[PDB]
Structures are given as C-alpha cells and as structure tokens.
Amino acid sequence: NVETVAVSPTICRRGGAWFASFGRERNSGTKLFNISGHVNHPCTVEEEMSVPLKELIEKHAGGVIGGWDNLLAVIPGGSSTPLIPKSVCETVLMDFDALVQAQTGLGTAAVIVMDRSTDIVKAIARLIEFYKHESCGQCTPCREGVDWMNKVMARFVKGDARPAEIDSLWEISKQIEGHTICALGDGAAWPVQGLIRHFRPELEERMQQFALQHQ
Amino acid sequence: ASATRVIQLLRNWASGRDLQAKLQLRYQEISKRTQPPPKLPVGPSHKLSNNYYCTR
Numbered sequence: 001n002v003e004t005v006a007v008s009p010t011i012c013r014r015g016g017a018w019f020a021s022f023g024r025e026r027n028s029g030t031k032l033f034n035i036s037g038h039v040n041h042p043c044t045v046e047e048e049m050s051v052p053l054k055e056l057i058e059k060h061a062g063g064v065i066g067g068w069d070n071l072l073a074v075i076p077g078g079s080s081t082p083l084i085p086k087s088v089c090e091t092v093l094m095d096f097d098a099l100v101q102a103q104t105g106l107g108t109a110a111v112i113v114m115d116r117s118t119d120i121v122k123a124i125a126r127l128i129e130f131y132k133h134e135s136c137g138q139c140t141p142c143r144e145g146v147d148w149m150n151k152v153m154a155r156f157v158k159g160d161a162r163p164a165e166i167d168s169l170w171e172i173s174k175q176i177e178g179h180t181i182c183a184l185g186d187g188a189a190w191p192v193q194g195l196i197r198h199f200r201p202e203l204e205e206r207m208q209q210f211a212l213q214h215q
Numbered sequence: 216a217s218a219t220r221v222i223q224l225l226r227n228w229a230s231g232r233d234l235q236a237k238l239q240l241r242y243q244e245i246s247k248r249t250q251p252p253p254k255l256p257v258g259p260s261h262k263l264s265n266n267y268y269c270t271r
C-alpha cells in the first residue's frame with residue numbers, strides 16, 4: 001500500500017521502537033483517518049493508532065451532525081466493513097484487534113458516519129449495488145451471488161420481501177464468503193451481515209409496512 | 216327410490232330388514248361432479264433457510 005511504503009523511510013530514520021511506541025501491542029504506529037458522511041467537518045487527519053472512535057470524530061470531524069445523540073451507525077473501515085450502532089461506537093477503539101472484537105475489522109480506517117435521519121437499508125443497498133458494479137465476474141460465487149444480493153436488497157429497500165427472506169439472504173452471504181477467488185466477495189457479504197445483525201427489526205418493520213399498504 | 220308402499224312392505228318382510236335406510240342405489244346424497252379448486256399445501260422441505268439438502 002502507498003501508506004505502508006511511505007511510512008518506511010521515517011521508520012528507518014527514527015527507528016522501529018519509536019513507531020512501536022504509539023498504539024497498543026500488535027496495533028502500533030500512527031494511522032490516516034478519513035471521516036465522512038454526517039459530520040460537521042468531514043476531513044482527513046493523521047492520528048495515533050488506538051484512538052477512540054468517538055474521540056476522533058469529535059476532536060477532528062467536529063462531531064456528528066446534530067450532536068452525538070443524533071448518531072445512528074458508523075462504518076469504521078470502508079465499505080467492506082460491517083456497520084456498528086451507537087452502543088458499540090460509544091467506547092470502541094480504532095485498531096485491528098479492538099474492531100475485530102467488535103465484529104467489524106479495522107479495514108482501511110475510513111469512517112463513514114450516519115445519523116438517525118438516513119435510510120440505513122438504502123445506504124447498505126447502495127453499497128451492495130457498488131459491489132455488483134465492481135465485481136470482475138471471474139468466479140461464479142461473487143458474480144452470481146452479488147447480483148442476487150443486489151436484487152434482494154433492492155426489494156428490501158421497498159419492503160417487497162417477506163421476513164423469511166432475511167435468513168435466506170444471510171445464508172446467501174455465507175455461501176459467498178470464503179468461497180471466492182479474492183476478497184471482494186467477502187467485502188460484499190460483510191456489510192449485508194452487519195446490516196442484518198444490527199437492524200433486523202427495521203427490515204421487518206419495512207416489510208410489515210409494505211404488506212399493510214399493499215394488502 | 217320410486218317404489219310403492221306395498222312393494223316396500225313386501226320386500227322388507229321378505230328380506231327381514233329395512234331396505235329404505237340402507238339403499239344400494241346412489242342418489243342426491245353423493246358429492247357434486249363439479250368441485251371448488253384445491254390448495255394442496257407444501258411439505259416440510261419448502262423452507263427458505265436452514266434447509267441444506269445434506270441434512271435431509
């Protein structure tokens with residue numbers, strides 16, 4: 001990676017011990033963070049590795065739009081990492097091991113924040129559509145399964161599905177993950193898994209509303 | 216059955232049983248030859264999840 005290559009001369013000049021002085025064990029150094037979405041001051045900033053997510057967002061991004069209480073969800077490490085809700089983002093650190101423990105993964109340290117005014121299902125469906133548009137098509141699981149998940153999420157956005165289809169979509173994502181040539185399939189399966197895990201009630205509510213107004 | 220009362224009495228006495236209660240000729244008691252459509256439910260394997268074939 002560009003950042004990995006670029007930090008190397010400074011590491012050689014100042015020593016590896018200086019770089020390992022920052023951050024926790026096995027998560028050492030400093031990291032570039034891109035905070036975007038529903039923040040007052042979206043920006044790129046370099047900061048110590050194991051910074052709390054809330055502390056980074058408030059200190060550098062100017063806080064969440066409408067205040068910290070207005071926060072709904074955060075994608076911590078780019079589109080390929082599962083989302084986490086406010087309760088997890090309250091006291092979570094920003095490094096590989098702590099974010100893996102929060103069932104997300106550090107990823108590329110790209111924080112995308114969403115307040116309680118955004119359709120989280122729509123955002124996840126847009127990400128899945130991106131992954132459908134970006135797959136190379138070489139291996140069948142990624143190709144066909146990501147197309148399938150894109151169609152299912154498009155139906156989910158309107159509530160045109162049934163509650164039994166949520167578990168089927170979960171199984172489809174599991175069938176994609178770990179069976180592809182590269183990690184694009186995993187990177188498409190994980191956001192769906194996170195959305196299901198943390199907002200199944202919202203999907204069911206949307207399905208009930210659509211069924212009620214369509215009869 | 217379109218049988219006269221006297222013939223019914225004679226056949227009942229001859230057989231020793233009451234024939235009218237259990238007749239061997241079908242009448243309007245049978246079902247209509249035109250029926251409403253059925254629905255025919257599905258079996259236990261029609262689930263959308265947790266239904267891997269290797270487990271059944």
Ligand code: SF4
Binds near residue numbers: 134137143184
């Ligand atoms: S998983 Fe990777 S190799 Fe397979 S189709 Fe998707 S992008 Fe191509």
